[PDB]
Amino acid sequence: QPALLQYHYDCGDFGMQLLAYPTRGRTVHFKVLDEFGTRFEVANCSICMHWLNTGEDGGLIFSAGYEGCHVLVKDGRYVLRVQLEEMLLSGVVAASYEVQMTCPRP
Amino acid sequence: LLQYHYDCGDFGMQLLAYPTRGRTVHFKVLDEFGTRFEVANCSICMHWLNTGEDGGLIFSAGYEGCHVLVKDGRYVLRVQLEEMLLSGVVAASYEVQMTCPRPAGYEILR
Ligand SMILES: *[C@@H]1O[C@H](CO)[C@@H](O)[C@H](O)[C@H]1NC(C)=O
Ligand SMILES: *[C@@H]1O[C@H](CO)[C@@H](O)[C@H](O)[C@H]1NC(C)=O
């Protein structure tokens, strides 16, 4: 059960984007993690500065404004901890990945 | 007889409640005037509601969110828990004052 999902994040001017490229028709659901281990489903919420998009290349994009919900300022940097759930169209999680997005890098 | 407790974290706080068979809990944020504010995830107020893997209910609040007050050098957020039956009736009502430490700036070393 190899966990081979390709993903990365890019730091922008007003927010950051997490891009994942699932294969074989799979999809990816994003969950924000807080300091207590609680998992927050990501849904379009403009006042939170959270948006979900699918790129023209088939990649799935979670965009978060630096001043959006659960983005913290730590050591003069915006930090958001996110769980990526690689999923079959049946809804089962095949693999789960955790990434700490820190912007600006490093 | 509702079991609940809260935790003070570094950036926010969480209130955990464990209602019994078939009951649920509704959360409302209280201000100094007694207004009861419904909690919604999609909100500028930096507060959220989730259901744990054990069926427990979790209220999360950032320290800089709506109606969090500074009192005696500490963050204070008052929340009402309404224990509710499947009929929609309120079985019990509890009020909790979540008090969490706040840092005194460098001025303390005047
Ligand atoms: C908030 O999101 C959680 C999932 O992360 C969901 O279980 C809960 O019902 C939501 N509460 C709302 C929308 O008030
Ligand atoms: C969410 O918002 C984006 C940006 O406006 C939009 O492209 C998308 O269709 C919306 N709905 C989703 C992701 O379900």
Residue numbers in the entry:
A (entry chain A): 22 to 127
B (entry chain B): 25 to 134
What does the paper say about this structure?
Whereas the latter did not crystallise, we could grow crystals of cZP1-N1 expressed in human embryonic kidney (HEK) 293S GnTI- cells and treated with Endoglycosidase (Endo) H, as well as the same protein expressed in HEK293T cells. Distinct sets of interactions mediated by these residues underlie the different homodimer interfaces: for example, in the deglycosylated cZP1-N1 homodimer, C′ strand F61(A) interacts aromatically with W72(B) and I68(A) packs against I68(B); on the other hand, in both glycosylated cZP1-N1 homodimers, the latter interaction is missing because I68 interacts hydrophobically with F61 of the opposite subunit. Additional contacts between residues in the ab loop/β-strand B region and amino acids in the cd loop stabilises the asymmetric structure of the deglycosylated cZP1-N1 cross-link; in particular, invariant Q38(B) stacks against highly conserved F57(A) and also makes water-mediated hydrogen bonds with the side chains of T59(A) and invariant D55(A).
Accordingly, a recombinant construct corresponding to the predicted ZP-N1 domain of cZP1 (cZP1-N1) is secreted both as a monomeric and a disulphide-bonded dimer, whereas a protein encompassing the trefoil domain and C-terminal ZP module of cZP1 (cZP1L600-R958) does not form intermolecular disulphides.
